[PDB]
Symmetry: C2
Subunit: 188 residues, 2 copies
Amino acid sequence: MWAFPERFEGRHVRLEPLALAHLPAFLRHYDPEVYRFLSRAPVAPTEEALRAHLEGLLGEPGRVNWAILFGKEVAGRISVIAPEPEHAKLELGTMLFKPFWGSPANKEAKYLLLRHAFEVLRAERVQFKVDLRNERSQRALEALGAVREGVLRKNRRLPDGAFRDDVVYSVLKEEWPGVKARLEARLY
Amino acid sequence: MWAFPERFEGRHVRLEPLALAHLPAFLRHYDPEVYRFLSRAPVAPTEEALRAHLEGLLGEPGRVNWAILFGKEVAGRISVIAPEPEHAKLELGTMLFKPFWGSPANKEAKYLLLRHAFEVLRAERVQFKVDLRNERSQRALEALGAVREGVLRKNRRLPDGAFRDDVVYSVLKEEWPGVKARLEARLY
């Protein structure tokens, strides 16, 4: 199994293990648009629904999550999803609260995880999955230099029964230096 | 959870639960080319390696496997991989022994599973993953009418440490009638 650090310290953000103690931040910044392109989106603007969403993140097998601290606030979270040491690959996903969109929080959170994945664990592949209707995230991954591999059609079903398409992106280890350079240019 | 039939009866083949009792067929028809584009390929032309490969198929969580009987011989196997009732999707994969390549065994095995997946379980999506170097299987999926969604680069690592790319194909439920028609034209 791969071991990850509990905490990361960046120039703009710091990361620490995501926990139930972070629930208050999710309750202080609830906005439907933030969860609309995520599976298991809070089913209602209530503490019970947001608690269920947070517990789902913390309970997915193999998933490792960090709260992203920006200044003195929790800006959102970043997740290592389905890490597979045997194939030297993993998936990464983030979610930021609306007020922090546009801040450097998301890029540095990714920068920090990607560096550990590629340089320390030496993963060969990191992938990202974005809802095809989520154009903001698609532009951000294209800006990061991630390669668009294609669209998994009807790859997830919503609770009302409708289906969503997942756009799959990846960064391979040989591509990390170039991606890393673009992230540093924008963060430092 | 979805329930599948233990047996299927086609015009050219019949399917029954894959089991250790089928090991003899794997030992009677060993050819490296048959396993070269599969993960966990038998590590040696020996009963011990083929037994490990068969037990790996039978032990993968959620995987359901059938021996394909062609005439009085086992022609290979077909597998439902990672079925996910919640998202109405699954992956399907087959492996046929060399002597049966070109027979109707593979198409009817797929025909039988696809019909149950789409018409009875009402899955919305069935996907297939093929090694990018496996051109025979890519041509067969294109002949079946499956949609090539893209290439998951370095999606699996071999035991020697080399990486393989996976080409991802799918058939959606709305496309099944057309695919079904092409399969019936060639089988009946």
